[PDB]
Design a protein around this nucleic acid. Sequence first.
RNA 1: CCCGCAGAAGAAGCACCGGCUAACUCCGUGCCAGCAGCCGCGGUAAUACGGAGGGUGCAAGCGUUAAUCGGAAUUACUGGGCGUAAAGCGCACGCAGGCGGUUUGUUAAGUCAGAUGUGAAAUCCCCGGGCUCAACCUGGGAACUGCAUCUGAUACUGGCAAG
Lengths: 100, 82, 65, 150, 129, 205, 123, 80
Amino acid sequence: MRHYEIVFMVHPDQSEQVPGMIERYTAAITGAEGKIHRLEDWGRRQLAYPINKLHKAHYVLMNVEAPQEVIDELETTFRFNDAVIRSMVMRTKHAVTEAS
Amino acid sequence: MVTIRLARHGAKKRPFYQVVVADSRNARNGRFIERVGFFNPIASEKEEGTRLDLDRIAHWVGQGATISDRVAALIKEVNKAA
Amino acid sequence: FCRFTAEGVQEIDYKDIATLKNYITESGKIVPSRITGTRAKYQRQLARAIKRARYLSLLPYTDRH
Amino acid sequence: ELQEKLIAVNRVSKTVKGGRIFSFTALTVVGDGNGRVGFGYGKAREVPAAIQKAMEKARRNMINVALNNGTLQHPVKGVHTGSRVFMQPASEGTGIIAGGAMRAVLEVAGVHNVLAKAYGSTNPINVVRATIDGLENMNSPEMVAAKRGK
Amino acid sequence: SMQDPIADMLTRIRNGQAANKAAVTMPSSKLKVAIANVLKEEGFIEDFKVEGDTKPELELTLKYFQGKAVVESIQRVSRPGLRIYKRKDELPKVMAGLGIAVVSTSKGVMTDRAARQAGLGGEIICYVA
Amino acid sequence: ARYLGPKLKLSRREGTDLFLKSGVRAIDTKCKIEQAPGQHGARKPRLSDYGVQLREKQKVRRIYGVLERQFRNYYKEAARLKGNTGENLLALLEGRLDNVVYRMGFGATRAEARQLVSHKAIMVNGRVVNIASYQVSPNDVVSIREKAKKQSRVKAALELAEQREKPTWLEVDAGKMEGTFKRKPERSDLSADINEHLIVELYSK
Amino acid sequence: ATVNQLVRKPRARKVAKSNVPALEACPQKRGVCTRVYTTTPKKPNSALRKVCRVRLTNGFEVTSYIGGEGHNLQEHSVILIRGGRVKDLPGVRYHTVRGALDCSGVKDRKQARSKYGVKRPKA
Amino acid sequence: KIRTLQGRVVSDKMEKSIVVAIERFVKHPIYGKFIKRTTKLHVHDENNECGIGDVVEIRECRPLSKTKSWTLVRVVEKAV
RNA sequence: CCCGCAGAAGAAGCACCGGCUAACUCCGUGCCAGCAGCCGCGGUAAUACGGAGGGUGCAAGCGUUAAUCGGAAUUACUGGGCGUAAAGCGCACGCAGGCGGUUUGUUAAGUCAGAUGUGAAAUCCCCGGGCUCAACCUGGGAACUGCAUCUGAUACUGGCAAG
């Protein structure tokens, strides 16, 4: 029941499938009695540097108030999944729902 | 004669026989009572080129509406499943 | 002077990118506080935020990628 | 940086003992690109000097306009002298449409999508600042909340 | 032959808010006190009051924020010369909804905002912005 | 129904690269590109607003090899389509089959692409297509037929297409003469200098 | 402009009829020439302009400017009237069609070849 | 109930029959005013009870002469 | 429709280039000859006439004329004005007609909400499908802004009664 901040990239070739992953993450967190504080998709923004060749990955933001274990299963999903690259998770002090 | 017959609504060399409840004394493509289905002799592989409306055409033929030879062949063709 | 002692900012948000474009020189290096006049309270959490944004590749490590 | 653009240059004249003396008049508009515009009208005996006086006057008596992100906040009509102006906010998928005289003063403002039509007199000198009227009293919901209470 | 008390009183608002007077007065009727209450609710008039019994008068007082008047564009729409009647969904949004249109609907009088969420139109009175 | 005249006149009028040549020679060496063609090319333009809008339209039409009636129909379709009509026009323009052949580099120029399409030489989803203006849907496999396969034309085309920017919305297979139109491109990919809003204004008048 | 006045009588706009009664608005007519004239123009211009007075098969009789460098039209010839109004000459509102029917095209013309009825030379 | 309609009787001297003003208060299509427009309806009755100064309720019936396609069923306010 | 033969071999014109409006120089002519949609060009140094070169715009089409809408808010319902630009009858009464102070009660015509029937199909729009694509053909939906009926609301107007 602590506040976390997730940003994850998607390989550009699976851009059409990303809201399904988003819904599946929200379904899992609501089943684990977590909630969503902000969800917004950034499109395919241009990278500063190519990673595993490529450019213009699909950026996704999320703010989650959650127990730790379901998030831990979530990073294991990010590691196992190849359609996701370059994930990053974060602690924040309180819940946040702002712009940018 | 209230009947059910065919109207070539397609183009030159590409027919589309809209099968319609029409009075027989009218023109083939003009006045009618009401559309019931369509046939396509030049249809693609995905079998959507033929459709009817079974209970409505049953209502007309129970009302006394005759049918033509081609639509008789097509009701024999759709049968119930194939 | 320090821009962040104005505006009452609680913490520098790493997803705020245009401000970091102003505080990162064209090489990609973090500027010293001795030039900007930023308070060291906010310089530390600032440079952390560039290191976060760099991980997301919103900011380049260098101009030779 | 404030996006100087010429609108129309005209030749006017004065009659004296010697005859006619012609003088050049230039109209221009400046503004950064977000809620900041100012028009200038300047005359000189030569064209480049005329634009120089006009734009130097334009970098003066600027006026502020309350916008949305890229558009107007409500329909407004702008009436000055003989010119009449009508303008609407437009969708983000729309470009900005107006007369050539209005395109400069709207483009330097930072709107990208305005439905704008000129009625009647369409001289540039009155059509601009017929546009500054209307933009001078564009109104925001927060400001009318300050007016009323909600 | 004064033939529109509502137009008369709306012009009392216009003249008072032009000459920056604190109060305006006019004779009284139920349509006037209703639209006065609507202006009260939407914050264009901060006090209205009904006095008298043999000849009832209405006194309204006026709002000024930075010296300039608060209401800036008030216009009667549906006139004795021409009547305007509007159904539920074609009700307008004054100044893209920033201003208001006051309307006399079948269940009473309210603004366009209240009428459109209650799902009924009617004899539209005037625009205020 | 195609220009079939001198291309560097067009490039020399536009002042920039219109990508109408293979690229094996420097453009400045091939033509003296800095001024317009003809006797009076060296003078100042002082070009009008209608002039610059016209020049941008002429530029995009001469890049994509499209005539006015077709490109007008492209505008009508783009304005018909939802979204930003300005990049909708470019999205329709990038769906052309000869444009696809050039973007995968099966032709040294888009004129080679057009000739190769017209000469019954591209197999698309197992169907050969003679139509140069054929609109390509996403997830489409295009291929070169067994005829004209391993021809010096397409070999040199690939070997001079390796030096390009390798577009992200296509998958290339240079050993099998196969390609995949995976997505329609976006405006951010394409040359960064097409001023589509000028075409929008010129046709809105 | 009051609504009751407009209910009593609606808005009435004049038709502002056509500049040419070439009749039934036909793009061309054919006619028999009454007489070739050579006429002086309006004040700012000076010329000896070649005009024809022609009797239409409709029945109307009007003037038609004879365009181009020279012409070989004589009496009773049948020509094609087109339209288009000439501002130097008051009273004429029409043009002939060169190269059509009895009217010959302009001799040895190279540019603007179509509008003066000349065949394309060998090149 | 049956399709019925109401109106002012204008004629009086009409033999076992009557003509009625049918006012309709309709909006103008262009200039928007609700204008008083009336029509005359040529109506049947037995032994000629009603007269001028009356409002009557009529129904469309089968033709009895030309235009004669209404019958009155009810009479109200039979006074000046 | 699919395959094979031969070789670039059998296939490019039209209008325009003074401003409006993208494209300019030379020669001939010299208020002549002529152009011209409006402004206007031409009377011996014409980017406007004619020819050439060059350029521009379209393209198996290209121009002119013809016709209708728009731009024209230039008949202005949306959306115009009447001191001097065109416009207040010379001035009054005055029937019809348009509008009308203020409350109560009634009615529900106008008005407004809902429901039903209907507004042929085709056409337009949108999501699909097929002709190598397109035009074209075509499924479904949406619309058809209408009319009529019936049930309700009575704030305002209209009607009535009482002040």
